[PDB]
Ligand binder design. Structure first.
Ligand SMILES: CC1=C(c2ccc(Cl)cc2)S(=O)(=O)N=C1NCCCN1CCc2ccccc2C1
Ligand SMILES: CC1=C(c2ccc(Cl)cc2)S(=O)(=O)N=C1NCCCN1CCc2ccccc2C1
Ligand SMILES: CC1=C(c2ccc(Cl)cc2)S(=O)(=O)N=C1NCCCN1CCc2ccccc2C1
Ligand SMILES: CC1=C(c2ccc(Cl)cc2)S(=O)(=O)N=C1NCCCN1CCc2ccccc2C1
Ligand SMILES: [Cl-]
Ligand SMILES: [Cl-]
Ligand SMILES: [Cl-]
Ligand SMILES: [Cl-]
Lengths: 396, 396, 396, 396
């Protein structure tokens, strides 16, 4: 059993492993498109001794973090171990090799979407965004008097075919992703894939439509089995007017009983309606997971809340070093030290704090971060918070 | 049709209306116990012209708000209009009369639990706490290495009969409620009621048991139909050790598949486990609703976050006046002014901000609070936040 | 933490532990009745250091094994560890103490019903009977021309109240249990309990009725929620005529859609009908578990199939010794030896073979019993088989 | 209404009748492939008077029976009567004609799979194999210490594409079918059909994968709707090592919650696991049905258990004659006699005994076989039993 970078001849075997490992396997053609984001030496395989019995790779991504800072990010994906070779340490060996390559290549952070929640914490990844499914019973939905875009005249939203307005979606999404923590740059190939998913499939998904505003769009389709459910696959809005206008149009889908969307916990939708309860949370789960590869680079690159006054502390990451951390005027300086630690946490915990989705004091209450200073906790809560709520861009 | 305070002879008619209006009607005996919290002139009825066709009352409560400040609070309850007298303006008339009496009596706030989410916003109530149901598949649940109380020796938790340890539950709960925003004083009669609900009922609920720690307790029972589900009706813990220890014991219920609890969005439970996903959010809803009766009294009484630096603004509540609001050193001063408003919101919106459950910037994104200054929004978000997360005490 | 025999003062604490551990806890009064079968020193408890945090006991039973031989049998029951004291080795300590007492008292076998299937194998217990639920859609059920009791005249079965024919049920059951492997003597107190379960409960089970034949009876009741399902709680028949007659009567329950029974895999019911498929197997599970305490006493006491010719072998039980085993003329002699083993198995595997419910060759195919001689396997299969199929008497 | 052998021009009408009669109708192309197994004069049709209103045929098969003896077997299939011509005696007429041709052609046995369980007993067919669905919750599944193939090093199983390893599956299956009662020779055309079913269908079944061992294979696919269920369509293993290894790999399908298989009642899978209950029996049904066409040829051809000592009896089959039956040294001699019968049974009952799936004493308890000698019953039980458990090859 040996570990190495795959040659072109290894890819059919990798696709076989993938097809048997991921029920949602996107298939050879789509896999090949996403492959254009995998750098040279971004992939490892494990051959028996011959067929591939393990694989993993990362893609070159661009992640927005608080303060509208964009970080090069290694996006782990296509991770699989053959059902015949479980419990043999293959995942650990593959992850170790990739992390070495990712660190040596100069990525400050790595990221992934987790197939299960109990696997990646031990490799330093913490859940950093939260997915929130809202299901609206639109038959009762009525907008509040305060909601934007309620006046007389024409509507600002248009019902369109997705493939005919690619440029407008691209430009709107590019604006969104640069200003929202969790945003990812979506390259041309991923727009090819997205629009391909928009068309109907025989025995599969129904046709997708779009609602288009100058400052926002929604892509939706009727559910394949529940014909009174419309599923919004993606809603991106850059202003409050655009967000409200798009939801007015969606609630105008009179043939539907329910509209569902995977969104974030701070989606203002419930407050747009006269009955906030109509926007039911039907599902909650971790979204993006983060491993901080370089602690000082990551902590210095991020913007911090201006409201908290300047403060200094000493942070130890359980293996990843000890640092004097000074935060003031929305910026951090993070330098080596051997002074006594005031805060301790595992590497994964820092990932969970990093985008502002989890509060330091909540993690402290579970003893995932240790300190004897509750004032320090309040300061970390406040500093690491994000002005603009953390969102999830797209799964990879 | 006339409106007045009920006499003793009106109560049988009120119980009839209640039994037909609330499927969860606690019954005459329990209603009579809760009645001991209703002040003289705390109730109104509407007679036809004779039977009672409308009723409403408030109870004298004590609500903890951020900064561990306890406010006298009028708790609206037992609100009903006969199915024969709908759409006749009875609710509006009853609420107006009660609010007048509540304001004249000197309550700074009123509160309630809403039967539906679309009714009480127009009377000035905003949802101020959030209920979060977690369902844990305990068969996979394993505690993180970091979690408290994992070492060798004896356990600190005892399995006990609720009725034999009333004093210990009372004292633990009293500690909890004084330090947590949303906490309510639970008087002797409500402990009588709680322990009465603990016993089994023929054809009804099963017997309740308790898990008792020096600094926490849990009350639970097996679900009446799903015999592999244990429902935690109440878990109150004053330290992280107590909270973890109680959950270790609950996950030790080997005869169960699932443990469910109605808790709050910042419950650290998910982070106690090696797989955070096992703590599934199965339900989300508004808890306590708040109407601020006196804006300056309420805003001055509350503690504010020390992290935000001193700032001043002008707040208009849509009918309830305009105020110069100065916040600094964790305190507010709130005085009358005719200077131009920098922030505007309806009265209900202020209730939703008041305990820290909803962010000003989220409400702004729905246009429920209007300002042209985003720095001011960040400052309000930070100031109104609560060090200790907002929780829900008990339904009334 | 200490282990000892309970005093009278320990029983309230034991009932508390029981009520919290067994959702089907029969309650103090019934527990007290079953207690009459627990010998002096038949119970152990574990106190903290004080409350009981662990308990286990055995009852004095009489088990029929093949050849209509009745063995004194220690029936483990009421086994529980507090949810607060899991993973502390309490079960292992309690089982070790009880097994020592059971062995020293002279029981050749111990037995139990398992709450879960993965717990008791490591303590030497193997599943020895198989429960088979049959559900008959009686609306299509038609008896085969060959089936007994189809001729003209009066019926031999009577519809009766269970409490008025106790003596007849007792005598029929006593005949059944003496001739069927798996049969248990049912003492007077267990008949008191059975007939008490026969009456209706407010909000609980419906009233039970009986169908009575000179050589058989059935006890049944309509399901509490599914009113078109009749559940046969117990059917005991000593002749084929009685068994068929009782099923003719049950299929005569014209108000029902379905009749269900927990029976054994060799129940002839399917073959009584013109469509064997109508007797659907809706559930399959282990029934009685057996631990052979004394290998030679147990193997010598049992009758063996006369069809297999005399043969000799050497059997090793993984800890419980090595024996020269000679089987011929339906009898075994089983003596100590140090000669090379021809068959090896763990103690639990022998329990699974002992009543004839599992074939040696099936267990060999899972490598639970090791031999290099397939002729020996065939001989063991044949010898250990039971003329009269293995059944399950009652749960304890 | 006349009955005759179909001409080429009758087949479109037969396919129409088939498409309207079998919801699982394999379609014209597949029907045409299976047709290659139908001998000249192996089919009958009934025309109105013109369209076909009835049809039936048999295929030339090779069935393995105990003692690894292979018998030519007429496999009835494609049996249908038009919904317009029910209750007209068409089935009886078609079956009578085919049985005459089958008997005259020299087949000792005929066989079928029954659409319903109440139809074929009256034509002499008895259910002779038993299908057992096991559903494994693989998330809890852990192998016993005794289970084969648990040691260190590489795995012996490979994950492969079915179409690329046809030869290896063929050879493994050929070994299996020759040594297992119930085995059927699978000709080249049926391997063409099987591998065609392996590919994905748009709006239909998902792609199939294989797990390949030198001495065994499994074919499986994810369920089309339940994406956490993997269905094993076929598992064939010639050694215990191969069977265990294949199940280790299947339980290694970490993306699945459950693995299901249609197997037989003696599958050792449950005993491979530390918790035998995890292998849940979720479904039970008759598999292959057998009609013995020639009683002495069938009874003489079969091998019998060597364990039972030589014995003689007189068997009457209700229409099919009376015979002196002598069984000894694993062989039977079966000759005509007019001596008094000691055992009587219908022809279908003998089919149910023939492969060892049903015990003579179980059938006696339902009065489906009559004798006044219980020693004789024990001898028949033992003699007709099969060393190697009866299995079901493939449906036809
Ligand atoms: C984009 C994508 C793939 C892909 C394919 C080829 C290449 Cl070169 C790169 C990525 S995929 O793995 O086929 N499933 C994809 N998307 C669906 C949901 C994401 N899942 C997938 C399962 C899996 C497995 C380990 C780790 C994470 C996740 C997150
Ligand atoms: C404590 C209680 C009552 C009560 C009874 C008598 C007296 Cl004097 C005071 C309170 S109750 O109304 O019978 N239902 C109670 N509890 C159950 C859940 C609370 N629901 C109840 C329905 C209802 C109706 C309007 C407004 C709020 C809510 C919140
Ligand atoms: C008869 C009986 C009990 C009993 C009570 C008191 C005395 Cl002194 C003896 C027996 S019981 O434990 O309350 N549940 C009983 N019957 C219901 C089903 C049996 N279950 C029960 C759960 C359990 C727990 C460990 C081991 C086995 C089994 C098998
Ligand atoms: C192989 C096969 C057919 C076939 C087709 C053409 C020829 Cl020439 C021979 C066989 S089939 O009848 O179309 N359905 C087949 N298989 C599916 C399951 C089997 N069912 C089928 C329904 C049916 C109808 C009566 C008797 C038995 C069974 C057992
Ligand atoms: Cl989002
Ligand atoms: Cl709460
Ligand atoms: Cl039984
Ligand atoms: Cl099979």
């Amino acid at each position: 059993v040996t570990l190495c970078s795959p040659t072109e001849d290894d890819w059919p075997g990798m696709f076989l492993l993938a097809a048997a490992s991921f029920t949602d396997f996107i298939g050879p053609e789509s896999a090949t498109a996403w492959r254009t984001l995998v750098p040279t030496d971004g992939a490892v395989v494990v051959r028996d001794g011959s067929e591939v019995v393990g694989m993993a790779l990362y893609m070159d991504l661009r992640l927005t973090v608080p303060g509208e800072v964009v970080l090069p990010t290694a996006g782990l994906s296509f991770v699989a171990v053959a059902p015949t070779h479980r419990r043999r340490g293959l995942l650990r060996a593959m992850c170790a090799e990739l992390h070495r390559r990712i660190a040596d290549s100069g990525y400050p952070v790595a990221a992934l979407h987790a197939s299960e929640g109990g696997i990646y914490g031990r490799f330093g990844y913490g859940p950093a965004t939260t997915l929130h499914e809202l299901t609206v019973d639109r038959r009762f939905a009525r907008f509040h008097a305060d909601a934007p875009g309620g006046g007389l005249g024409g509507s600002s939203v248009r019902l369109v075919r997705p493939t005919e307005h690619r440029g407008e979606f691209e430009a709107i999404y590019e604006r969104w992703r640069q200003q929202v923590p969790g945003g990812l740059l979506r390259p041309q190939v991923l727009w090819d894939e997205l629009l391909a998913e928009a068309k109907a499939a025989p025995g599969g998904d129904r046709e997708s439509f779009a609602l288009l505003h100058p400052d926002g769009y929604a892509l939706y389709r009727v559910d394949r089995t529940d014909l009174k459910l419309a599923r919004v696959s993606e809603l991106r809005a850059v202003t409050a007017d655009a967000h409200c206008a798009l939801w007015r149009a969606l609630i105008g889908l009179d043939s539907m009983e329910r509209i569902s969307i995977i969104t974030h916990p701070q989606d203002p939708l419930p407050h747009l309606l006269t009955d906030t309860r109509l926007a039911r949370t039907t599902w909650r789960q971790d979204g993006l997971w983060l491993r901080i590869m370089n602690v000082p680079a990551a902590l210095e690159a991020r913007g911090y809340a201006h409201e908290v006054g300047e403060f200094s502390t000493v942070l130890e990451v359980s293996d990843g070093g000890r640092f004097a951390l000074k935060i003031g005027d929305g910026r951090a300086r993070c330098t080596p030290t051997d002074a006594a630690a005031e805060i301790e946490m595992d590497r994964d915990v820092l990932g969970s704090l990093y985008l502002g989705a989890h509060r330091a004091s909540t993690l402290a209450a579970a003893n995932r971060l240790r300190t004897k200073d509750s004032q320090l906790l309040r300061r970390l809560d406040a500093a690491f918070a994000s002005d603009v709520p953390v969102q999830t861009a797209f799964e990879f």
